Amino acid sequence: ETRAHAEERLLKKLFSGYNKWSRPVANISDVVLVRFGLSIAQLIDVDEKNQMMTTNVWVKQEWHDYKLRWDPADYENVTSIRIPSELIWRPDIVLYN
């Protein structure tokens, strides 16, 4: 009945046969839309001599995964969880320059 036990049940169900190396689309032709944003914490340095810019940013990302879905009615009205980001698929967004 306790929320922790329900969360444990949900975690055990979610990652039963989850593969973090596979793109999370139900159909191969589907595209994963990634909502991308930046949020700058501070402008650390502008090195004019070396032509480099150092910034502290928050890289906000948001996408949909079709396998990580549940009905909150089956898990004590648990509506969202926090899990380590290295257990799931993530987009490989990199800074080019």
Ligand X SMILES: *[C@@H]1O[C@H](CO)[C@@H](O)[C@H](O)[C@H]1NC(C)=O
Q: Which residues are at the interface with ligand X (CB under 6 A)?
A: 27, 29, 77, 79
Half-sphere exposure of 54 (CA within 13 A, CB side): 6
Of 16, 21, 35, 40, the one binding another protein by CB under 8 A: 21
Name the DSSP class of 67.
S
Distance between CA atoms of 59 and 38, rounded to whole angstroms?
A: 5
Residue 31 labelled as part of a binding site: no
**Interaction of residue 80 with another protein, rule CB under 8 A:** no
Residue 59 labelled as part of a binding site: no
Distance between CA atoms of 4 and 9, rounded to whole angstroms?
A: 9
Residues of this chain that interact with another protein (CB under 8 A) are 2-4, 7-8, 11, 19, 21-23, 25-28, 50, 76-77, 83-84, 92, 94, 96-97
